[PDB]
Design a protein around this ligand. Sequence first.
Ligand SMILES: *[C@@H]1O[C@H](CO)[C@@H](O)[C@H](O)[C@H]1NC(C)=O
Ligand SMILES: *[C@@H]1O[C@H](CO)[C@@H](O)[C@H](O)[C@H]1NC(C)=O
Ligand SMILES: *[C@@H]1O[C@H](CO)[C@@H](O)[C@H](O)[C@H]1NC(C)=O
Ligand SMILES: *[C@@H]1O[C@H](CO)[C@@H](O)[C@H](O)[C@H]1NC(C)=O
Ligand SMILES: *[C@@H]1O[C@H](CO)[C@@H](O)[C@H](O)[C@H]1NC(C)=O
Ligand SMILES: *[C@@H]1O[C@H](CO)[C@@H](O)[C@H](O)[C@H]1NC(C)=O
Ligand SMILES: *[C@@H]1O[C@H](CO)[C@@H](O)[C@H](O)[C@H]1NC(C)=O
Lengths: 248, 223, 312, 212
Amino acid sequence: YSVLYNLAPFFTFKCYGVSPTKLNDLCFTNVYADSFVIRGDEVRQIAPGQTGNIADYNYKLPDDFTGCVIAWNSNKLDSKVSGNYNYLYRLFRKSNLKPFERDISTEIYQAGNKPCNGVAGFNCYFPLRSYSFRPTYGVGHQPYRVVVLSFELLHAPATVCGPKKSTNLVKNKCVNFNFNGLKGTGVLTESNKKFLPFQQFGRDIADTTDAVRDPQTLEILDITPCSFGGVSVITPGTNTSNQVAVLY
Amino acid sequence: QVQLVQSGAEVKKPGASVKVSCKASGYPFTSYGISWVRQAPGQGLEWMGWISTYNGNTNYAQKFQGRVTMTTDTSTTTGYMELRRLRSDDTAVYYCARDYTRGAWFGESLIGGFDNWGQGTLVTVSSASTKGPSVFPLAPSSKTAALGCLVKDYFPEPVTVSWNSGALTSGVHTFPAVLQSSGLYSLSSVVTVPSSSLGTQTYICNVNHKPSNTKVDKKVEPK
Amino acid sequence: QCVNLTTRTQLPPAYTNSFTRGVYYPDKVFRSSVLHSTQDLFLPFFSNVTWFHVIKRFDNPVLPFNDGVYFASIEKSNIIRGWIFGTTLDSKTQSLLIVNNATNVVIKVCEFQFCNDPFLDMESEFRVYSSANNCTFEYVSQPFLNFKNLREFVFKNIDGYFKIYSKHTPIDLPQGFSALEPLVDLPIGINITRFQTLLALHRSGWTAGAAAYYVGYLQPRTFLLKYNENGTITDAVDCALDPLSETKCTLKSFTVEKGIYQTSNFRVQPTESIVRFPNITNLCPFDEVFNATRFASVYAWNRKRISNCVAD
Amino acid sequence: EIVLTQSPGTLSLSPGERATLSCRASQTVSSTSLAWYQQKPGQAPRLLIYGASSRATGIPDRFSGSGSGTDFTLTISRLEPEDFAVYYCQQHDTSLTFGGGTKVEIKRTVAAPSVFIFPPSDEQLKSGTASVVCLLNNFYPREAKVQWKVDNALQSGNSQESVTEQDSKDSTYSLSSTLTLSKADYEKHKVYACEVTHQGLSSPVTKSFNRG
Ligand SMILES: *[C@@H]1O[C@H](CO)[C@@H](O)[C@H](O)[C@H]1NC(C)=O
Ligand SMILES: *[C@@H]1O[C@H](CO)[C@@H](O)[C@H](O)[C@H]1NC(C)=O
Ligand SMILES: *[C@@H]1O[C@H](CO)[C@@H](O)[C@H](O)[C@H]1NC(C)=O
Ligand SMILES: *[C@@H]1O[C@H](CO)[C@@H](O)[C@H](O)[C@H]1NC(C)=O
Ligand SMILES: *[C@@H]1O[C@H](CO)[C@@H](O)[C@H](O)[C@H]1NC(C)=O
Ligand SMILES: *[C@@H]1O[C@H](CO)[C@@H](O)[C@H](O)[C@H]1NC(C)=O
Ligand SMILES: *[C@@H]1O[C@H](CO)[C@@H](O)[C@H](O)[C@H]1NC(C)=O
């Protein structure tokens, strides 16, 4: 993701759930790219918890969306003098769209109670409407290309992340470890658990990660914290002596 | 830097199969596809095809639809070009280019073109064998003065010409080679010298032909 | 090419009891010696499941594909082969299909043109479809494979992902517990509502062997699963079956001592809905503006202000 | 498929003028799917403009492109001695197509040649064939018409013509014509002539030679 500021000055770059700033260290399961074209006034509709014509009839984002949106003006490539009618949207629908749903219905909208008989008529408007993009329109009406990136974070191998080199595997000592985006501290030892081939990491009664699978070799490693304890100081009065004893 | 290298020239017989290699360096091989284009001597460019490095999907031209094959090997990052039923019209220069028009992953069009090309591969077709060059001097008339050295039936095309080992380089004119109906080559070298030095100064024409290993040199004198 | 055959034995399908079947691992996290409560799509305990018997008996109706499906097969000599999923089952929409014809499992997600009875019958007769439009995804791998074969499968379609859990065992569904380990996960994104089973007849004119397949529907509910020392699910409790199971889930244990326990809260829900608004009174003078007898010219357009009324 | 036309066929300019080249498409083509290429003699073509407006990396700012709909142009503000090459326009909107090639050369003052004639050498008389040569020294412009005459008329067919490239210093052309014919008919004639007509000359020049 380091090479992304090499296009026209982006007008919208908003990222939810992950900070874009030099944070290509996270490993994801899969990535989804959703590309479309809208007008400038509709760009604000592409966000969690936003209501609008495009939001409920063309593209709805979840309230817990984890990912980002990049929208940039594309007037020089999608504006024609005669008018570009190749970009269409949906304005009439019976019910609002569910998140990440595609609607390609061409049926005539039954605005009234009488049937439309499959032809244009009274109380029968075509669901598809044309943007009619031209360079002479306003800033809000100018065409804009929008790409939405959705990241998947599950208990999966998660084989999509940045260029970070791996090191050797060392055991039987308290070290800092980064197992495929999962950071921690402790000693890793050979584990005697009967992991199943579809399983990745284990868990304990205290609901914490206590076992991992090496993403290079089919080996299960138990994770334990390094040595810990409390210290007590036994002393007589300072009015008597300066000698002390220590209890671990 | 991005670098491309190709194979050598071929003098194979008509009807055989041509095999070309395109080796890439300094750029991710899988991320980019490979385009094969040709340029005929005396003509312009003529694109043939495109090959994707991610899954091997290819796109051929309708003119060579039944003769062209492209493959890729990611171990050595080498593209392999195999053309069957070679004809006499295939004598041209072949160019291997990095494709930035169609994406290798999704197969859709992209804003760009061939931004990096190879060194070019010469393909020559002729149903004939090699032969040592035949050299003939051309003397000035009895009446600046001019003279020359004409070479005929030298095969293949690669041949070098020298006049006194570069002492008189300024004044040597070498016309482009011309092919006759017998599949044999022709070339000429022309030297212009002052008319006061025809009988004193020495002029030698030397023709070097590597495949036949000849360094034949002749003195050129007025007649 | 299609085969015409309507020798089906028209009879109502049987109904049977799914006691404690349809339990699958809900996640890839390893656990051991712990009781875990999870809310997910499961087959309810002691449920009504439809039973189809195939022997002539040849019934392959297209069944619905609500939020999940539990498929069971009591089989010998591998009569049941594969499945097809879709909504329209034509080229209008997307179609998904799986074949396991004792060679290798093949998954095909494209546009089809099925006949009125897609099925199969050495093996040299494939009469399922006649068209092949654009394609989306493909998958090839190892085959999934008194009656002695019992095969259990769970099919889910969540967020455009097709999840298939499977289990095989040697042998009215038998009473017992057997968890279903996950097998396949596919990023398809297909609108599935209706589905069909795939049979392979034994031509002699054919005589299909005896086989049985059961279908049940999944529902969202909370379960309490028990793991032994090894990471295997050995017992489960459905927290919505009866008051005793709900008490067990509340106490987070499989045994209950004598006493009285405050289990939950009960409440009733509304049936209808009503809306009351004051009235439609002193409507705005829109009729006066629209139905004026004489209209002014364009240069001298009549301008009026309307306020403090109902804009009908 | 679509066909691209280039204009003009050849450009004659000076190192310091402004160059404008035109490419026209028979059908409507998207501006984003048009590219310009400049191939100098002796090296592979290089990309300079893609998308009909944007500049390629490592390309001087003097080159530019523009156009719309069915007509596009490439503009060079100033001409350099290394900027003379063969220019191509390629469109990939429908399949992929290239252009024939627009060549831009150096325009200079009108000069005159030094046409000479060279009879076949003595060693060819025993080889069964004799080859006579007609030479054209530094001349400009390139357009010159050459013919062979065996003492009574105009002859063609049995002749091979060679024209060099743009000269390094004087930017002038040198031409060669070869006529090869068997000794049986070569001895049948004594006087031959080579005729050269050029714009620089005010009258066509004929050079005749006999046996000796
Ligand atoms: C690469 O990763 C695979 C994943 O299973 C592993 O089997 C293989 O050993 C790895 N190769 C190296 C050189 O680490
Ligand atoms: C099979 O049955 C259908 C049902 O009407 C009929 O239309 C068709 O002609 C029959 N034969 C074939 C070969 O499909
Ligand atoms: C549900 O199951 C019971 C007993 O298992 C049975 O009596 C009843 O008929 C079933 N429901 C239907 C609709 O058949
Ligand atoms: C059916 O089995 C044969 C081998 O008997 C195999 O070649 C073929 O691919 C299989 N077809 C399907 C749809 O699985
Ligand atoms: C692919 O889909 C298009 C419409 O999206 C349809 O017109 C076309 O027929 C399909 N391809 C085939 C082979 O049917
Ligand atoms: C699947 O298709 C049916 C056909 O009517 C439609 O009602 C339903 O909304 C579709 N599902 C989705 C998620 O769009
Ligand atoms: C668990 O695995 C061990 C492995 O040796 C086995 O002996 C035991 O029977 C398994 N089951 C239980 C309940 O311990």
